Amino acid sequence: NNHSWLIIQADIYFATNQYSAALHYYLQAGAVCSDFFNKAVPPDVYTDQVIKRMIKCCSLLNCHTQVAILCQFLREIDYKTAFKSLQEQNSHDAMDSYYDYIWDVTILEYLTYLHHKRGETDKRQIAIKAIGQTELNASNPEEVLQLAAQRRKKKFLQAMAKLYF
Amino acid sequence: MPILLFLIDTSASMNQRSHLGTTYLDTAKGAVETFMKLRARDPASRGDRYMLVTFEEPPYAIKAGWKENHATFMNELKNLQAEGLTTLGQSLRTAFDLLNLNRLVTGIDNYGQGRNPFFLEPAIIITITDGSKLTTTSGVQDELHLPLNSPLPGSELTKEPFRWDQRLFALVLRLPGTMSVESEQLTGVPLDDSAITPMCEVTGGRSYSVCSPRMLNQCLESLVQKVQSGVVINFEKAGPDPSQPWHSCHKLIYVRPNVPIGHWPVPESFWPDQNSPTLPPRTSHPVVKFSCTDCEPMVIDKLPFDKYELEPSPLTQFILERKSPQTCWQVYVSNSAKYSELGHPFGYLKASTALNCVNLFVMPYNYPVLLPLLDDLFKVHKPTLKWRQSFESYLKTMPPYYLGPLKKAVRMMGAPNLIADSMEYGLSYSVISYLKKLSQQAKIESDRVIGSVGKKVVQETGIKVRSRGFQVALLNKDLKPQTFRNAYDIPRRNLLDHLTRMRSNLLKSQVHSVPIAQMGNYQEYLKQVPSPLREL
């Protein structure tokens, strides 16, 4: 349960292109620092480097919706990598089931446009319903939005913990 | 008659619920109908053109343009779907192109022949949007950049997509998910902070940031108050004070018709010469510079002059604060004279005698040397050659495009066969030929775009099954199941009932799906029905 050593092991697995093992140990470090993602992970443990490497690991496992969700964990949301990964059509990560974990209106707007362009009307309706939530309104008074982001972070990271260990 | 072009945001971020329970697109549509109701309260809007542009692809972006009636505009405003990206720059470019494609074929712009404020087609663009980031299917933009990739022919003559008589107003929807208690919402509406705000301010408009339905109604009332007929003039401070906010303003002057009448143009920013092949690009708002030093308004009898009332602004507040209607502030555009870069005063800013409004009086190009001279001849004189050598000295400094208006003015004044009636050289033959070719191409895309707004864009989609050219069909909206003519359209669940219905139809032994607006046709159904007899 030493989070720094878990980060070191995850980095070693990431260096040898063992992306599933790297995600396993990155999520283990995040579960150490919080209480299984009940608290927010401290930013000196999930730094931008660690979240970016988790993004790369999820990209190379073709879990592209997980890439889109992990892109908004950063200090500034990486819309380029999220939009690039969401365009992929070989996904292994239950694409529309993960739309609850997306709190950013821009990513959901891109998802709705992408599903309308490809004729995926059902996923387009799911994305429109996800945008049409009062808690996800971008004009919410900056504390409703923060709590929505935090609860989606907790739920998503617990889902990844269940998936990878 | 004014043009009301609505640039509705149809990006998918417009599917955001408010505390009202409706999406931002529903609020946008309702804002448009309430705006049209408040506009129809004004009885001067009997002739008024409504246009609709969305954020979709340029085949589908213009939903109602020229030669589209009220019914098509309403039927397409109701049927908007927010399923796109926030392509604000491309949509703004298409909206300005839809406003400006007729300008070169009908010659409102009057290129190279002076800027005529009475040559206007007054339009405003009301864009209704949210504060979401702009997206162009590669990332966010965080700054508004109108693309210049497929220019309309003649777009380089103005160097800015918007024109003299066009103002962009943003109605930025920021209705929160939960209702916010506020008693200060009855105050003035704040300017929005999105990327649309500087583009609204550079065209002489402003952005409205709503946060409640009552703030929305207040903004709609303010927007109804801003539907005017005029042109936007950039005023600048030339000399020192007689930086404070009255130094620069993209204010609006008013052009009241009686069709508008006028005689003198606002002078160009260059000196016309026949050596130059290409006409210089002029700013869409003519940068005029007022002289803060006090002068005297100079008006003689029977004089064709045009008076334009400025809209209320910090400049007019500054002028009316220094209460002195007997004086005036001379105004001129820079680089208009042949030699001097400062230019000669083409007019003055004089406050009204009632201290109510500030009027821009446009005059001939150098009125302090022509009005005493022309007034001297029409007071004393049969011109004398001592006067005519002075008149030639004035005509040596006058720009060539003023020669026509000066000729007409002295013709209606009482001196028809004056020197101003002798010849008119004007521009360079390359420039006239270029303008005529630009008019022809402007007609070409004028009849191209107008033919393509409706019944020329049909979208069909496919699944496009990947290999690891086949596609899977979708449930089309215009499926039109010809079940009585095609047996494949009959579902198995009602095959027997439909079978016996077809058997009853063919032998001697859908309907009532009228689209709602026509199912209660009071006048139409009785018109086809025969008339009864009349009463005793």
PDB file of N, CA and C in Angstrom, chain B residues 204-245:
ATOM      1  N   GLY B 204     -20.694  47.162 -34.191  1.00  0.00           N
ATOM      2  CA  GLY B 204     -21.612  48.135 -33.647  1.00  0.00           C
ATOM      3  C   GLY B 204     -22.751  47.561 -32.841  1.00  0.00           C
ATOM      4  N   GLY B 205     -22.750  46.257 -32.585  1.00  0.00           N
ATOM      5  CA  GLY B 205     -23.740  45.624 -31.749  1.00  0.00           C
ATOM      6  C   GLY B 205     -23.206  45.316 -30.367  1.00  0.00           C
ATOM      7  N   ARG B 206     -23.899  44.415 -29.676  1.00  0.00           N
ATOM      8  CA  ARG B 206     -23.495  44.016 -28.336  1.00  0.00           C
ATOM      9  C   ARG B 206     -24.035  42.625 -28.048  1.00  0.00           C
ATOM     10  N   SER B 207     -23.477  41.999 -27.020  1.00  0.00           N
ATOM     11  CA  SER B 207     -23.880  40.669 -26.595  1.00  0.00           C
ATOM     12  C   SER B 207     -24.700  40.764 -25.317  1.00  0.00           C
ATOM     13  N   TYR B 208     -25.774  39.989 -25.252  1.00  0.00           N
ATOM     14  CA  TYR B 208     -26.643  39.949 -24.087  1.00  0.00           C
ATOM     15  C   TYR B 208     -26.470  38.616 -23.376  1.00  0.00           C
ATOM     16  N   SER B 209     -26.173  38.672 -22.086  1.00  0.00           N
ATOM     17  CA  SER B 209     -25.989  37.484 -21.261  1.00  0.00           C
ATOM     18  C   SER B 209     -27.211  37.348 -20.363  1.00  0.00           C
ATOM     19  N   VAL B 210     -28.118  36.462 -20.728  1.00  0.00           N
ATOM     20  CA  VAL B 210     -29.326  36.250 -19.944  1.00  0.00           C
ATOM     21  C   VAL B 210     -29.054  35.189 -18.890  1.00  0.00           C
ATOM     22  N   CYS B 211     -29.807  35.256 -17.796  1.00  0.00           N
ATOM     23  CA  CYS B 211     -29.723  34.253 -16.748  1.00  0.00           C
ATOM     24  C   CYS B 211     -31.082  33.867 -16.191  1.00  0.00           C
ATOM     25  N   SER B 212     -32.169  34.390 -16.746  1.00  0.00           N
ATOM     26  CA  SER B 212     -33.516  34.129 -16.265  1.00  0.00           C
ATOM     27  C   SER B 212     -34.486  34.465 -17.388  1.00  0.00           C
ATOM     28  N   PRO B 213     -35.708  33.924 -17.352  1.00  0.00           N
ATOM     29  CA  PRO B 213     -36.695  34.298 -18.380  1.00  0.00           C
ATOM     30  C   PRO B 213     -37.046  35.777 -18.396  1.00  0.00           C
ATOM     31  N   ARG B 214     -37.056  36.446 -17.241  1.00  0.00           N
ATOM     32  CA  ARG B 214     -37.355  37.874 -17.238  1.00  0.00           C
ATOM     33  C   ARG B 214     -36.195  38.680 -17.808  1.00  0.00           C
ATOM     34  N   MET B 215     -34.958  38.247 -17.547  1.00  0.00           N
ATOM     35  CA  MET B 215     -33.810  38.856 -18.206  1.00  0.00           C
ATOM     36  C   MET B 215     -33.856  38.616 -19.706  1.00  0.00           C
ATOM     37  N   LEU B 216     -34.337  37.439 -20.117  1.00  0.00           N
ATOM     38  CA  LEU B 216     -34.511  37.157 -21.536  1.00  0.00           C
ATOM     39  C   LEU B 216     -35.533  38.095 -22.167  1.00  0.00           C
ATOM     40  N   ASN B 217     -36.648  38.340 -21.477  1.00  0.00           N
ATOM     41  CA  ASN B 217     -37.659  39.257 -21.998  1.00  0.00           C
ATOM     42  C   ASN B 217     -37.133  40.686 -22.059  1.00  0.00           C
ATOM     43  N   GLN B 218     -36.334  41.081 -21.067  1.00  0.00           N
ATOM     44  CA  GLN B 218     -35.714  42.402 -21.080  1.00  0.00           C
ATOM     45  C   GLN B 218     -34.758  42.554 -22.260  1.00  0.00           C
ATOM     46  N   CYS B 219     -33.953  41.523 -22.527  1.00  0.00           N
ATOM     47  CA  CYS B 219     -33.051  41.557 -23.675  1.00  0.00           C
ATOM     48  C   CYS B 219     -33.814  41.572 -24.989  1.00  0.00           C
ATOM     49  N   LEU B 220     -34.935  40.857 -25.062  1.00  0.00           N
ATOM     50  CA  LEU B 220     -35.723  40.862 -26.288  1.00  0.00           C
ATOM     51  C   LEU B 220     -36.367  42.221 -26.528  1.00  0.00           C
ATOM     52  N   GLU B 221     -36.820  42.886 -25.461  1.00  0.00           N
ATOM     53  CA  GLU B 221     -37.343  44.241 -25.605  1.00  0.00           C
ATOM     54  C   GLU B 221     -36.252  45.209 -26.053  1.00  0.00           C
ATOM     55  N   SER B 222     -35.049  45.073 -25.487  1.00  0.00           N
ATOM     56  CA  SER B 222     -33.928  45.908 -25.909  1.00  0.00           C
ATOM     57  C   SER B 222     -33.548  45.644 -27.362  1.00  0.00           C
ATOM     58  N   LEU B 223     -33.616  44.383 -27.793  1.00  0.00           N
ATOM     59  CA  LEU B 223     -33.292  44.040 -29.172  1.00  0.00           C
ATOM     60  C   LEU B 223     -34.340  44.566 -30.140  1.00  0.00           C
ATOM     61  N   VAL B 224     -35.609  44.563 -29.727  1.00  0.00           N
ATOM     62  CA  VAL B 224     -36.657  45.175 -30.540  1.00  0.00           C
ATOM     63  C   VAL B 224     -36.425  46.676 -30.653  1.00  0.00           C
ATOM     64  N   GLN B 225     -35.956  47.302 -29.570  1.00  0.00           N
ATOM     65  CA  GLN B 225     -35.642  48.727 -29.619  1.00  0.00           C
ATOM     66  C   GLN B 225     -34.456  49.048 -30.522  1.00  0.00           C
ATOM     67  N   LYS B 226     -33.632  48.064 -30.874  1.00  0.00           N
ATOM     68  CA  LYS B 226     -32.431  48.306 -31.661  1.00  0.00           C
ATOM     69  C   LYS B 226     -32.595  47.956 -33.134  1.00  0.00           C
ATOM     70  N   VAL B 227     -33.812  47.661 -33.586  1.00  0.00           N
ATOM     71  CA  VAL B 227     -34.065  47.426 -35.006  1.00  0.00           C
ATOM     72  C   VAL B 227     -34.288  48.792 -35.650  1.00  0.00           C
ATOM     73  N   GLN B 228     -33.236  49.349 -36.242  1.00  0.00           N
ATOM     74  CA  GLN B 228     -33.281  50.673 -36.838  1.00  0.00           C
ATOM     75  C   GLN B 228     -32.769  50.603 -38.269  1.00  0.00           C
ATOM     76  N   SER B 229     -32.895  51.720 -38.974  1.00  0.00           N
ATOM     77  CA  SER B 229     -32.404  51.855 -40.342  1.00  0.00           C
ATOM     78  C   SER B 229     -31.270  52.870 -40.321  1.00  0.00           C
ATOM     79  N   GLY B 230     -30.039  52.378 -40.362  1.00  0.00           N
ATOM     80  CA  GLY B 230     -28.896  53.270 -40.335  1.00  0.00           C
ATOM     81  C   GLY B 230     -27.622  52.517 -40.634  1.00  0.00           C
ATOM     82  N   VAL B 231     -26.514  53.250 -40.578  1.00  0.00           N
ATOM     83  CA  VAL B 231     -25.199  52.703 -40.870  1.00  0.00           C
ATOM     84  C   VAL B 231     -24.263  53.042 -39.721  1.00  0.00           C
ATOM     85  N   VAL B 232     -23.301  52.161 -39.477  1.00  0.00           N
ATOM     86  CA  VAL B 232     -22.413  52.262 -38.326  1.00  0.00           C
ATOM     87  C   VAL B 232     -21.158  53.010 -38.744  1.00  0.00           C
ATOM     88  N   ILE B 233     -20.868  54.108 -38.058  1.00  0.00           N
ATOM     89  CA  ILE B 233     -19.736  54.963 -38.378  1.00  0.00           C
ATOM     90  C   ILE B 233     -18.775  54.959 -37.200  1.00  0.00           C
ATOM     91  N   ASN B 234     -17.511  54.648 -37.471  1.00  0.00           N
ATOM     92  CA  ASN B 234     -16.478  54.680 -36.447  1.00  0.00           C
ATOM     93  C   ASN B 234     -16.011  56.116 -36.251  1.00  0.00           C
ATOM     94  N   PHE B 235     -16.277  56.671 -35.073  1.00  0.00           N
ATOM     95  CA  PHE B 235     -15.844  58.015 -34.722  1.00  0.00           C
ATOM     96  C   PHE B 235     -14.559  57.940 -33.912  1.00  0.00           C
ATOM     97  N   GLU B 236     -13.627  58.844 -34.200  1.00  0.00           N
ATOM     98  CA  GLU B 236     -12.348  58.892 -33.510  1.00  0.00           C
ATOM     99  C   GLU B 236     -12.019  60.328 -33.133  1.00  0.00           C
ATOM    100  N   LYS B 237     -11.239  60.484 -32.068  1.00  0.00           N
ATOM    101  CA  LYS B 237     -10.781  61.803 -31.652  1.00  0.00           C
ATOM    102  C   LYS B 237      -9.525  62.165 -32.433  1.00  0.00           C
ATOM    103  N   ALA B 238      -9.578  63.280 -33.161  1.00  0.00           N
ATOM    104  CA  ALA B 238      -8.444  63.689 -33.982  1.00  0.00           C
ATOM    105  C   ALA B 238      -7.398  64.426 -33.155  1.00  0.00           C
ATOM    106  N   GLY B 239      -7.781  65.549 -32.555  1.00  0.00           N
ATOM    107  CA  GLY B 239      -6.863  66.344 -31.776  1.00  0.00           C
ATOM    108  C   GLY B 239      -6.947  66.046 -30.293  1.00  0.00           C
ATOM    109  N   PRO B 240      -6.543  67.003 -29.467  1.00  0.00           N
ATOM    110  CA  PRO B 240      -6.612  66.828 -28.014  1.00  0.00           C
ATOM    111  C   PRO B 240      -8.032  67.067 -27.511  1.00  0.00           C
ATOM    112  N   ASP B 241      -8.196  66.945 -26.196  1.00  0.00           N
ATOM    113  CA  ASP B 241      -9.485  67.200 -25.578  1.00  0.00           C
ATOM    114  C   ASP B 241      -9.820  68.692 -25.643  1.00  0.00           C
ATOM    115  N   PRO B 242     -11.106  69.041 -25.809  1.00  0.00           N
ATOM    116  CA  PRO B 242     -11.519  70.447 -25.859  1.00  0.00           C
ATOM    117  C   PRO B 242     -11.373  71.157 -24.517  1.00  0.00           C
ATOM    118  N   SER B 243      -7.412  57.185 -21.434  1.00  0.00           N
ATOM    119  CA  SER B 243      -8.288  57.585 -22.527  1.00  0.00           C
ATOM    120  C   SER B 243      -9.753  57.486 -22.123  1.00  0.00           C
ATOM    121  N   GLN B 244     -10.471  58.595 -22.266  1.00  0.00           N
ATOM    122  CA  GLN B 244     -11.886  58.623 -21.946  1.00  0.00           C
ATOM    123  C   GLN B 244     -12.679  57.825 -22.984  1.00  0.00           C
ATOM    124  N   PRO B 245     -13.806  57.218 -22.584  1.00  0.00           N
ATOM    125  CA  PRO B 245     -14.525  56.316 -23.505  1.00  0.00           C
ATOM    126  C   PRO B 245     -15.141  56.997 -24.718  1.00  0.00           C
TER     127      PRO B 245
END
